[PDB]
Design a protein around this nucleic acid. Sequence first.
RNA 1: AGAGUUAAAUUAUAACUAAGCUGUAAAAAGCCCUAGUUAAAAUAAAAUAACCCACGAAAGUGACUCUAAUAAUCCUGACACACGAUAGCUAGGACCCAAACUGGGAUUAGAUACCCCACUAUGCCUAGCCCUAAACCCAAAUAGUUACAUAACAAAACUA
RNA 2: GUUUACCAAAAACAUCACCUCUAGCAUUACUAGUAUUAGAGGCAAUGCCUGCCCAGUGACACCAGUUUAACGGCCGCGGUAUU
Lengths: 122, 175, 72
Amino acid sequence: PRYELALILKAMQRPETAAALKRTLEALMDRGAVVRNLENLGERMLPYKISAHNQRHSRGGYFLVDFYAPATTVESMMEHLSRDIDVIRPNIVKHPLTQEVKECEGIVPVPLEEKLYSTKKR
Amino acid sequence: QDDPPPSMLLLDYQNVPGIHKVDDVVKRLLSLEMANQKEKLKIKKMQLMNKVLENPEDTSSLEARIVALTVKIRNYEEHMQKHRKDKAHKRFLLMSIDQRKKMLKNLRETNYAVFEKICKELGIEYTFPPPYHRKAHRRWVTKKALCTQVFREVQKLKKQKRALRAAAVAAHKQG
Amino acid sequence: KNILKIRRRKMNHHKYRKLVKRTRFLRRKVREGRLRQKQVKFERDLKRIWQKAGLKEAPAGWQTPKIYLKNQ
RNA sequence: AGAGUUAAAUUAUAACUAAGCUGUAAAAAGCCCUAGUUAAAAUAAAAUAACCCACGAAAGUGACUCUAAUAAUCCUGACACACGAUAGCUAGGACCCAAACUGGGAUUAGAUACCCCACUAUGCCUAGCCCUAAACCCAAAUAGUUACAUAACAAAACUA
RNA sequence: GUUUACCAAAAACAUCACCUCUAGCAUUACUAGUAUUAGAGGCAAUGCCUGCCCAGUGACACCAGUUUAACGGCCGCGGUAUU
Ligand SMILES: [Mg+2]
Ligand SMILES: [Mg+2]
Ligand SMILES: [Mg+2]
Ligand SMILES: [Mg+2]
Ligand SMILES: [Mg+2]
Ligand SMILES: [Mg+2]
Ligand SMILES: [Mg+2]
Ligand SMILES: [Mg+2]
Ligand SMILES: [Mg+2]
Ligand SMILES: [Mg+2]
Ligand SMILES: [Mg+2]
Ligand SMILES: [Mg+2]
Ligand SMILES: [Mg+2]
Ligand SMILES: [Mg+2]
Ligand SMILES: [Mg+2]
Ligand SMILES: [Mg+2]
Ligand SMILES: [Mg+2]
Ligand SMILES: [Mg+2]
Ligand SMILES: [Mg+2]
Ligand SMILES: [Mg+2]
Ligand SMILES: [Mg+2]
Ligand SMILES: [Mg+2]
Ligand SMILES: [Mg+2]
Ligand SMILES: [Mg+2]
Ligand SMILES: [Mg+2]
Ligand SMILES: [Mg+2]
């Protein structure tokens, strides 16, 4: 997976939410995207009140869209999602599953530094 | 400017068997379409080293380096065309150019044939370093301009005096 | 310690700056006269050049631009 | 280097409530179109992490996201080429807050200072200049050695 | 470049430039335009600059307060370094 779209949607009923998700996904496929998956993180009360589109929002729905897109297009998508009034806040991140975990082999302990000063007898 | 086509199926995935039998979607994810810029650069490097070189296997040869560097340089050129004020990459560009020109001065002193070829193929034009780098300033530029003009005038007037001499002595000798 | 040297230079510079402030327009006049002199000597140089080359007038279309007197 | 974004403050601005608020070693002047609480754009700046020691040639760089990207098969090298903190200059835009100058208030023998209040150039953005710093880690660059050997102090001594 | 046709052609006027003020808008001017515009003025390209003053008089703000590239203003007397 290449990009990860973190989507925070206005908290709404079933049909309208499905609607927004649909037109958003379409909007993605239109900029040339291939959508791998859609996940739902549920609706929660937001960490802090978010002001967007002349509305101050308390709650919201959370979604992940993993997808492949040409490098060029991210900006484009962003623009779109900015002017959508049903989106509380967009973000697009290089997918966490592209970066792979190197091995902590342990903690190499650091010896106390030596020869910082001369052998002078005070 | 060249064009490494959007469908070109990036370098590591070209030689794996039965690739073309795969459906359009996976073929598209492995395309230069979904690719980075660095992928297009890998491809451009390959294509150039194949077009220009003799033995694309040697990375160690002077000419191989000159090609790689030329790719890099062209990329920076592009970057600098988008970002005018980026000083970091203007440094990279100029620096790298100097490195290339140094390696060129080295090829021209060891293998002349290959040097000639490369210069033709990459469009690189090798110029000799002037003796005496000095800053050309207002006074010197202006004075030099005048001196050149005075020279041309003087020799032009000598030519006119010789045309008058020839005409006079000829019309005298005839009758 | 070494600050004594630095103190000397400090004072000198300060004094000097003060001086330039006071003497400013005198200095201005003088620098302008020097630039005039410069332009003239440059002209003489060029005139000497085309004259010792045998020509009478300066070569066709030669205005001998003003480089020093260039508006600041 | 681009483009997009904003958590904590802060403020225009209302709504209640209170007559004071601010300010110092102590006061005065200032402000009561003030103050506390509840609402809030823009602007600017980037707690904690950081007891870390990374990136960049140096200057520098530590809020978030993405794009582009960090010369040389790697010796030295200019007056040539390209950069270069803060301040400063030109033109346009921004202005919360800070603040040279300046004006008030104290202090003082004086006080064209230190302290208090107010406000400006300026700090910010775009484009172009300017090319300087105790630009100092006061320790040149590249390879090495820990042999000989303590002027003093400091960051031990040396070879090419 | 302009001016006192018939006693003055100039150092007067205008002028590029720079500055103040006044305007948020439709069928006769400005203008079939719209603040990078249009009017009322000052001064005289460029260059270095344009210091201090809002008490008076104006003009804004119908009162406070703000304005000098608005009208205009920008000081003394006595004592001191042997002289
Ligand atoms: Mg001295
Ligand atoms: Mg920028
Ligand atoms: Mg504001
Ligand atoms: Mg009081
Ligand atoms: Mg922060
Ligand atoms: Mg490198
Ligand atoms: Mg070198
Ligand atoms: Mg600088
Ligand atoms: Mg400015
Ligand atoms: Mg200011
Ligand atoms: Mg203040
Ligand atoms: Mg005072
Ligand atoms: Mg600045
Ligand atoms: Mg420094
Ligand atoms: Mg030094
Ligand atoms: Mg060196
Ligand atoms: Mg007359
Ligand atoms: Mg007449
Ligand atoms: Mg006349
Ligand atoms: Mg007459
Ligand atoms: Mg006149
Ligand atoms: Mg001016
Ligand atoms: Mg003038
Ligand atoms: Mg004045
Ligand atoms: Mg008044
Ligand atoms: Mg008044």
